[PDB]
Design a binder for this molecule. Structure first.
Ligand SMILES: CC(=O)c1ccc(-c2cc(NS(=O)(=O)c3ccc(C)cc3C)c(C(=O)O)s2)s1
Ligand SMILES: CC(=O)c1ccc(-c2cc(NS(=O)(=O)c3ccc(C)cc3C)c(C(=O)O)s2)s1
Length: 558
């Protein structure tokens, strides 16, 4: 079974595409080596098509079935509700792709009769037809990176009407089931601090810890019909209304298992027989399937007390070491088993004995010290991509503000604090847009956030320690300094000066702005302040922020 089959029609763009970093009067203050940054375009779609097109083979043994039976037993305890049309509509992002049937995200969010009527019609069709493949659009994603160039990734999604129907039938399922089936192993239930806490405690739970990350080669393409039907059988274990059962069966047969691909010009590009990257179940399905295969593989490889952390296709395993030589052999067997389950590795997995050396979800655990000198572990990552994207956002407004999402997720880091916060608050101040809400993404879901609320948000997600970390590790320091040299990003003395300036402007503004100045830039002054809990913090409603992953799920909140 080929992951895809093609007709020859090109994967066309839906709008003008820029590959080179746009430059304005602000660019240089952040990055000088402009030619290092680029954005992927449909022009490289061909290359990607060749990488994601291959045959899949699967040999399922008793370990696989034993793990599956256990997962289904847990899924049976779940009771999920069918969402109402209005509820599903409110979860639609304001700028989500418009329907091909005469209405857009705006009409959906406002519950217009035209949109609500078509949605209802699509729903009825799902109930009465469980065989006809549903159309999907295939587009080349425009993503920014630093060279040393990768081809654009591909996104496959059904019409807006179908997406609302997916929410109605499955939102409650994909939001509640993974945590029940996988418990503490389900990664999306954790905020960055909780993820670090889980990784550290798990590591400490082993007499002689050993860990490794497992990178599957183009995971979506390795997902087979069997995998997708297996996922449906797990969903069906839930206590569901009969109408929901029918809808899930229908969406599985007509959309999740596969279907035709249509480019932006309306031409048939081919056919998909693997995971669709732009459906509501993409994250939950990848997570369940990755966890199923990995769990079974741990048994085949005989790993001791293998604890796992799964986020979609991202997998991290921490177990009890049985000796260096043996761990290496076990990992080999693990990879062989994963391969038999149609989850071949991209990069061969290697055993690590230093927690901080394991990268998962493009991040790693590191350590610093708080105002009290106490050791504190936090999540960080290589800042190259975040900075390249920040450069792009410096001269171009985008649907998703990566800089804001990165400040929220990596607030305790040296780079997010010194550069991202300083640079963007400087711009927000000059343009008087501090109070303007911006969209960013957390675990795949889109959120509208006011920059002025960052202090509270950071306090709630990372704790006051995020505003006073210091004495970072040499490893982290060198990686940050190397990245800055590579990109041609100005040094500390420059950022410290800009930070003091920004901090002074914010303080004068008063209100929330002053709070931003005091907490976000305390590191920039020589005579540090108090920094005590923020009252308004408790006000913020962060429920649903770290519950589940919705990558490509077309999900919006507030
Ligand atoms: C290349 C480069 O600019 C740098 C390399 C290492 C640097 C570092 C500056 C520090 N100290 S600091 O100047 O007080 C500082 C600056 C900025 C923030 C957000 C926090 C703190 C505590 C470091 C540390 O304490 O570990 S590492 S700065
Ligand atoms: C307290 C603390 O750890 C720090 C305070 C300021 C730091 C800084 C370290 C730097 N550079 S470095 O690449 O890390 C570096 C290069 C060469 C040597 C010989 C040493 C270093 C550290 C800074 C800068 O470039 O502005 S500030 S690091």
């Amino acid at each position: 079974s080929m992951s895809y089959t093609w007709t020859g029609a090109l994967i066309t763009p839906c709008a003008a595409e820029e590959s080179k970093l746009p430059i304005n009067a602000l660019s240089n203050s952040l990055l000088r080596h402009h030619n290092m940054v680029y954005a992927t375009t449909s022009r490289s779609a061909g290359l990607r098509q060749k990488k994601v097109t291959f045959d899949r083979l699967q040999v399922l043994d008793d370990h696989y079935r034993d793990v599956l039976k256990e997962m289904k037993a847990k899924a049976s305890t779940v009771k999920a509700k069918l969402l109402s049309v209005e509820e599903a509509c409110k979860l639609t992002p304001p700028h989500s792709a418009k329907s091909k049937f005469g209405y857009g995200a705006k009409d959906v969010r406002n519950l217009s009769s035209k949109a609500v009527n078509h949605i209802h019609s699509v729903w009825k069709d799902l109930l009465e037809d469980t065989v006809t493949p549903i159309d999907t659009t295939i587009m080349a994603k425009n993503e920014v990176f630093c060279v040393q160039r990768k081809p654009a990734r591909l996104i496959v999604f059904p019409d807006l009407g179908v997406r609302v129907c997916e929410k109605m039938a499955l939102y409650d399922v994909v939001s509640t089931l993974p945590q029940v089936v996988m418990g503490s192993s389900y990664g999306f239930q954790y905020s960055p601090g909780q993820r670090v806490e889980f990784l550290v405690n798990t590591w400490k739970s082993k007499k002689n810890p050993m860990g490794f990350s497992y990178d599957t080669r183009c995971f979506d393409s390795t997902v087979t019909e069997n995998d997708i039907r297996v996922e449906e059988s797990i969903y069906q274990c839930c206590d569901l209304a009969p109408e929901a059962r029918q809808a899930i069966k229908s969406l599985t047969e007509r959309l999740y298992i596969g279907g035709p691909l249509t480019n932006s010009k309306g031409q048939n590009c081919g056919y998909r027989r693997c995971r669709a990257s732009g459906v509501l179940t993409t994250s939950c399905g990848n997570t369940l399937t990755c966890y199923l295969k990995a769990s079974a593989a741990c048994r085949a490889a005989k790993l001791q007390d293998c604890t796992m952390l799964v986020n979609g296709d991202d997998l991290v395993v921490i177990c009890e070491s049985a000796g260096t030589q043996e761990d290496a052999a076990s990992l080999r067997v693990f990879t062989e088993a994963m391969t038999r389950y149609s989850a071949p590795p991209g990069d061969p997995p290697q055993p690590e004995y230093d927690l901080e050396l394991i990268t998962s979800c493009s991040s790693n655990v590191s350590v610093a010290h708080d105002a009290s000198g106490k050791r504190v572990y936090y999540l960080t990552r290589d800042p190259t991509t975040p900075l390249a994207r920040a450069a792009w956002e410096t001269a171009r407004h985008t649907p998703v503000n990566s800089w804001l999402g990165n400040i929220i997720m990596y607030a305790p880091t040296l780079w997010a604090r010194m550069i991202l916060m300083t640079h963007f608050f400087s711009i927000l101040l000059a343009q008087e847009q501090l109070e303007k809400a911006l969209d960013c993404q957390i675990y795949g879901a889109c959120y509208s956030i006011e920059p002025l609320d960052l202090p509270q948000i950071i306090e709630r997600l990372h704790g006051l320690s995020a505003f006073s970390l210091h004495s970072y590790s040499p490893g982290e320091i060198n990686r940050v300094a190397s990245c800055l040299r590579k990109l041609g990003v100005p040094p500390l003395r420059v950022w410290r000066h800009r930070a003091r300036s920004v901090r002074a402007r914010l303080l004068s503004q008063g209100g929330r702005a002053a709070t931003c100045g005091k907490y976000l830039f305390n590191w920039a002054v020589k005579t540090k302040l108090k920094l005590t809990p923020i009252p308004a913090a408790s006000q913020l409603d962060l429920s649903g922020w770290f519950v589940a992953g919705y990558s490509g799920g077309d999900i919006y909140h507030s």
